[PDB]
């Protein structure tokens, strides 16, 4: 599925999102853009071999499970494939634990080159919310 940005926004926020772990909405909103371009089904290969799923580009490296990852973990206890569905709820609730780790939402590589330190309100500027 390739979400509208305030249809991505709605269910993100549905999904409690909004100012988890002090981050606002626009953030997860801007990290799905330029992660998978809001599209459910994105996947893009690591060079470590590692693969990274969904709206959200989460990886097999420790969040899920893909049977292709040697040494990897799955800490989200899911099928990377679940990440991949139209239903973003597994994505959500993945997030939410891959954001409580440690470093935020620095663990999304193009949040913090793309959207930290920007204005990320704009990504949900016009949306029924």
Known sequence: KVFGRCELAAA?????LDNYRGYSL???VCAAKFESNFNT????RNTDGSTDYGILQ????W???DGRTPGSRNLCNIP??????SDITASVNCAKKIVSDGNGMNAWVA??????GT???????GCRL
């Open 12 to 16: 993100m926020k549905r999904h409690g």
């Open 26 to 28: 626009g953030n997860w």
């Open 41 to 44: 089904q994105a996947t893009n």
């Open 58 to 61: 989460i990886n097999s490296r």
């Open 63 to 65: 969040w899920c499970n």
């Open 80 to 85: 990377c494939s679940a990440l991949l569905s």
């Open 111 to 116: 949040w913090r080159n793309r959207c930290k």
């Open 119 to 125: 204005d990320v309100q704009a990504w949900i500027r």
